[PDB]
């Protein structure tokens, strides 16, 4: 086969509206700020935008705790703004993907308000209410965001389930009336001409019959137990049959907690579930499975073996998204590259090259196109994220981990690293806001901003632009098959992308010294498609490359 679609060949950009552009001085990005910057995105070469949740929310989890699914978040604007965003993107031939958060609602959602009003309320079993055991929680389930996954309610004396914050009660998908209400809600958004849906933690919808305790072992890897719900594929396939297949959309599945060998069932096109896999294997390759804020050393051989495994898993019938950072992870150049002033731009370009030459839909997270870095967090109160406060409570306040060792890690791992405001220019607060930004701007905005880069042909921005253009022009870079030349090489990452006789080579030097790299077999260069940081010229039929430190390139190979 090889079944091309607009979503397989799109280059997506992810906008985290809270941090993109504030147009009214309250310190918080808003819909008008996205609208006002569409020409900037269009100039980058972006096809499609995925926005993080835009709905009415008290913001315990920055939009992921939704109090009304049919209303715009007060901080982002009005319904008129949203409809104008859709319409201005349509004018520019850009498609919008929205974030669908239906594993749970805010505890202020009308459904929960009613549900918690008493056992006899019609909405009682829109959520999960269970009696305690021996004066304790129903079972030993922990929450991703701190403490127990069960919260006691005084009125009724029962506990309600929350995998995420106390303010995110989990919806009861086993109740057909819940599923039918959530479908009605999707059609409301789909009817406005939205072109994609990203399903937040899509794999936790089905809860485990009778809530048994997790074993000591399971407590150290509990996400995977929450994804074992026996009806998860029935529910996703049902939502496909009753809603998704009735519209013309691309659907992404965020499979948090799903082992890779179980991912294909969500994305195999024959199964009629979802289109695009968001996996965690690569982006958190170096994260501890138990203490999930903690990181460890990783090597290039480990990284490339994951890329290849994730590629093979999707195989012929599935499809991958490919991203190196987003609003839940550290910035790619700091995490996967070298963010020191001598290497930052070279590494950012190398990782852009890697990103834009995967057999996957690439997602470019806001500010990565400038080479934005992690933020120098000092003290615990410099962080905002509910998640980091939950880890601090579980691990530091219980005395299990010294505060300083915890900070050493979360400085490198915290989601807030991606959430500092987008650095537009060199002006006060990087031009993000006229007032006080909700989260401090990185002081490196003076060196790293869009205004310094958009007209500089050597910039990280224009290198991304050139790579998008190249990807659009060379079908092997989207659909071609992927072969790693040496999964055990810890210095030079080299792989081929092949469609029939059209064969391309991507080479990235991960070392900060010169690497000579002789090609294997009979491979030789036909053309240089692009390089960054090269010094030696590549001629026809070369079988060797002298790679500068952090050099990256794409080459066409002779047939
Ligand atoms: O709401 C729970 C979580 O699920 C989502 O899919 C988001 O990516 C993450 O930011 C959020 O905290
Ligand atoms: Ca604002």
Numbering used by the authors: 42 to 600
Lines quoted from the article behind this entry:
SIases, classified as glycoside hydrolase family 13 (GH13) enzymes, catalyze the isomerization of sucrose to produce isomaltulose and trehalulose as primary products and D-glucose and D-fructose as by-products. NX-5 (named NX-5 in this work) that predominantly produces isomaltulose (~87%). Similar to other GH13 family enzymes, the NX-5 molecule is composed of three domains: the N-domain (residues 42-145 and 216-520), the sub-domain (residues 146-215), and the C-domain (residues 521-600). Among them, residues Asp102, His145, Arg239, His368, Asp369, Glu428, and Arg456 are responsible for sucrose binding and residues Asp241 (the nucleophile) and Glu295 (the acid catalyst) are crucial for sucrose hydrolysis for PalI, MutB, and SmuA.
Inspired by the work from Ravaud et al., we obtained the crystals of the D241A/glucose complex by co-crystallizing the D241A mutant with sucrose. Asp241 is the key nucleophile residue involved in the catalysis of the glycosidic bond cleavage. In the 2.00 Å structure, clear electron density of D-glucose rather than sucrose was identified in the active site. This demonstrated that replacement of Asp241 with an alanine residue did not totally disrupt the hydrolytic activity of NX-5, as observed in the complex structure of MutB D200A-glucose. Moreover, the D241A/glucose complex structure may represent NX-5 in an intermediate state of the sucrose isomerization process and could be used for molecular dynamics (MD) calculations. The structures of the D241A/glucose and E295Q/sucrose complexes are highly similar with a RMSD value of 0.14 Å, indicating that little conformational change happens after sucrose hydrolysis. After sucrose hydrolysis and the exiting of fructose, their side chains bounced back to the original position in the active site pocket. To elucidate the mechanism of the product specificity of NX-5, we used the GOLD program (version 5.1, released by the Cambridge Crystallographic Data Centre) to dock fructofuranose or fructopyranose, a transition state analogue of isomaltulose or trehalulose into the active site of the D241A/glucose complex structure.
